[PDB]
Design a protein around this ligand. Structure first.
Ligand SMILES: O=C(Cn1nnc2ccccc21)N(Cc1cccc(Cl)c1)c1ccc(-c2cnc[nH]2)cc1
Lengths: 302, 299
């Protein structure tokens, strides 16, 4: 069972580069607006202690270089929404897909189209960690790369890359500019909080194993959600939500294994280990496949 | 450090649906030609034991229905190159990228755009195993999905998917229709040769694990190339060539760990196991990152 990004063509046609001063990063061109991180307007020295409201007053439309490839798009208006700069341009992107801006939950996955200078470099699948970082693969100049999900040719944009933290994980915003987690767009000592394992995803992976005939771990017990949540937290596992129980519905229905029965199976694995057995060929419990990722991998979606 | 696929947009614009009789799969539309697996001309019975030249001569242009999204393309010619059917259509694909057909060597990596009924489903990075299978993620209806690399906007197509073997691994051809491996497009049970591990890729990935701040596997020993290759063969690893040592140069220069030093680390990992520890998040020695893949993603 391997990770699988969404096809990225619909997002590739929306990638541009945004330059202000000497700073160049990536932007997302949808209809007649270009979205990018607001720290583009900072100098290498401003970023240490910025005042974004007053830095933006000093800027004009003619201070922003937006390019689709080498083709300039004239900026006809600018504004700041949270941590995102919105540059109105004079051309509506004819490649604009049907799209939505969504804010995702910790544990959810998305594809990231890594870009440099507005040029798509690669695509890979990421999970939002419970500490609101992603273990992405970004180099300098990757800021403004976006993460997304596709559902029947509507692109749901959920992530915009802003920075790398000291431990090498990445932080960013949704497309309305609101950071995921307690991070701010200033170059100061910031630390990701302690991470936990995404329980709903581990369960999805156990269902994937059952679907493929590996079911040695199914046991004979059950548990309540509240009791499972209290035990899981003792192993640094995330508690389950009512929404988590519901998105596990299809896999539970497909296998005939009740969600709370699978919780008791997981609890036994946490309490006693795997005893040198494997699951889907792993001795480690994998937590970066959502229930939709498992469904998607076994359905010929689009 | 993640497995990273090429952006699939240039290939997405080339995927179409090919239907012959009751069989439907994906085709690759470039210019005025549509390439697809030739077993689309087989019925459920033909596939059990086909004589393809005999089956093809009996087909007409109107037997093949090609759909690009909603438009139907008119087939105006058909021929066969090894296991690949080539349908000439009456319209050029305006989205044809600069492209080349290439045959990749075992151990090389490529991106796969998995498709169903001519519509893209997902993209992921794959490696040609030394036994010429690939460990892909394909389901029914994925035949005709292609593998590719992209270099400065030129798409090098290297694989077309044909079937899943009973072990769950996958087999297919280059775009000239020649299978990778000793397989045939007849629905009969087919085993592959015993697989081996791509040593140069494992070494590249350990270098990536050092670039990313993880050194627990390193040790002080060093080894000769031949002495490493003896242990490598013992554990069913592919030989390491002097070309491989040179390919790993940039990675050894970057980290200040000589290649034969990293080989001694890997040999200790092979003999002692990993003791329950992990490298770059994995519990097993990963072998589907080439040195180029590491260099690109780490620089
Ligand atoms: O495995 C596949 C196709 N496939 N590919 N990925 C897959 C993933 C999951 C399941 C199936 C998959 N096979 C079986 C096969 C095995 C070895 C050799 C051959 Cl030739 C076929 C197949 C291919 C063509 C036809 C066909 C029928 N009528 C015209 N064509 C019918 C069956």
């Amino acid at each position: 069972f391997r990770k699988m990004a969404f096809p990225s063509g619909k997002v590739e046609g929306c990638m541009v580069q945004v330059t202000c001063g000497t700073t160049t990063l990536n932007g997302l061109w949808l209809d007649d607006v270009v979205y990018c991180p607001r720290h583009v307007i900072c100098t290498s020295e401003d970023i240490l202690n910025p005042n974004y409201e007053d830095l933006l007053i000093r800027k004009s439309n003619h201070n922003f270089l937006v390019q689709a490839g080498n083709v300039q798009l004239r900026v006809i208006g600018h504004s700041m929404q949270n941590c995102v700069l919105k540059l109105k341009v004079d051309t509506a992107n004819p490649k604009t897909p049907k799209y939505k801006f969504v804010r995702i939950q910790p544990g959810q996955t998305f594809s990231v189209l890594a870009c440099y200078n507005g040029s798509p470099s690669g695509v890979y699948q990421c999970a939002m960690r419970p500490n609101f970082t992603i273990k992405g693969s970004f180099l300098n100049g990757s800021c403004g790369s976006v993460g997304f999900n596709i559902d029947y040719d509507c692109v749901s944009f959920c992530y915009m890359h802003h920075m790398e933290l000291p431990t090498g994980v990445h932080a960013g915003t949704d497309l309305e500019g609101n950071f995921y987690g307690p991070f701010v767009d200033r170059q100061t000592a910031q630390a990701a909080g302690t991470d936990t394992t995404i329980t709903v995803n581990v369960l999805a992976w156990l269902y994937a194993a059952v679907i493929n005939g590996d079911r040695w771990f199914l046991n004979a017990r059950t548990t309540t959600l509240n009791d499972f949540n209290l035990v899981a937290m003792k192993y640094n596992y995330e508690p389950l939500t009512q929404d988590h129980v519901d998105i596990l519905g299809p896999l539970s229905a497909q296998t005939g294994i009740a969600v709370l029965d699978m919780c008791a199976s997981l609890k036994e694995l946490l309490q006693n280990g795997m005893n040198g057995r494997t699951i889907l060929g792993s001795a480690l419990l994998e937590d970066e496949f959502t229930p939709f990722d498992v469904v998607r991998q076994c359905s010929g979606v689009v």
